[PDB]
Design a protein around this ligand. Structure first.
Ligand SMILES: NC(=O)c1ccccc1O
Ligand SMILES: NC(=O)c1ccccc1O
Ligand SMILES: Nc1nc2ccccc2[nH]1
Lengths: 187, 185
């Protein structure tokens, strides 16, 4: 991840005009949609929290959690810490990031700061759902000037995306004012 | 450098009881001593600054600044960022690290935060002098509970080092209260 840290703008775009910041959400959403697309009920929920973090939930199969035999850490950690630009870029540029994976009846949780995992991916409970959820807090050491998410920027893009991804339900929620949208196209 | 940030304890020592924290200084000092050994004068100065940073100055040749043919960045940057434990460890665990090299008539300067270079090593001026200086501010995300440098802990170790490195003068200064020592065998 140090390559990204060294030159953030080569990976995420302009980190001062808001464009980079919103790219962060779109990269996460891209991964989520690819997760949702590989199930029948396909749903993703994009939430803008009051603390200016964003979470993206998918009801997919759940990112793989097994230990990667070469890297010696969970496959999820590898995905979040190695290398659309990849989710590891979002992680590298987040002051915090919380990963929650439901798979094989288990809840898996990990936390990152600035791309550095605070502990190994841990089974912390049980569940009968499946899916991956990523919530991130953009690094204010990187993103300057425009540091808060614009509901409308997200809405427009999610709506455009809905017509390309048939059968995928996409919900957008803004916890700062209670605004909500649901984009779900026919097919 | 992510393997150090992932388990800093394994590289530097205990990060909650003051062990790791002082060890950051000792690693830097080892590098400085190596440098002072290969020049004339042979002196290092260790300074505790009032803002809980430490600086370690040598009067050595200056560490090399030329571009590293494999890594493609200055050799000094290679030293500060690619994995005694290595000064890269110190750099990785410091919220800020300032590097100043006086080499071949020129002053070179670089700033890191959490081991990330803010810019490439750059020529900033001319000088007569030779030497390397690193000043580092230990990360308060890593180092907890014991977060202020203890004078006498540094003093104890430097004294031992003075006997082992016979020709080297080691000065220790505390800017918080003016305390000072001079260890020279
Ligand atoms: N946020 C997600 O749901 C996600 C899903 C799969 C891979 C990476 C991700 O960030
Ligand atoms: N601080 C020094 O005088 C030093 C000298 C050589 C290499 C790394 C260093 O930290
Ligand atoms: N605050 C902060 N910024 C960082 C950048 C890279 C790794 C760790 C860091 N902690």
């Amino acid at each position: 991840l140090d390559a990204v840290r060294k030159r953030p703008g080569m990976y995420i775009g302009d980190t001062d005009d808001g464009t980079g910041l919103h790219h962060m959400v779109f990269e996460v959403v891209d991964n989520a949609i690819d997760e949702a697309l590989a199930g029948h009920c396909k749903e993703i929920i994009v939430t803008i929290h009051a603390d200016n973090s964003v979470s993206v939930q998918d009801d997919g199969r759940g990112i793989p959690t097994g230990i990667h035999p070469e890297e010696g850490v969970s496959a999820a950690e590898v995905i979040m810490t190695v290398l659309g630009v990849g989710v590891s870029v979002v992680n590298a540029l987040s002051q915090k990031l919380e990963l929650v994976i439901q798979r094989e009846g288990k809840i898996h949780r990990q936390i990152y700061e600035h791309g550095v995992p605070q502990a190994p991916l841990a089974v912390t409970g049980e569940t009968e759902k499946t899916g991956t959820m990523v919530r991130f807090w953009p690094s204010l050491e990187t993103f300057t000037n425009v540091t808060e998410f614009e509901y409308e920027i997200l809405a427009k893009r999610l709506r455009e995306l809905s017509f390309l991804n048939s059968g995928v339900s996409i919900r957008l929620r803004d916890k700062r004012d209670g605004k909500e949208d649901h984009f779900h196209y026919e097919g």
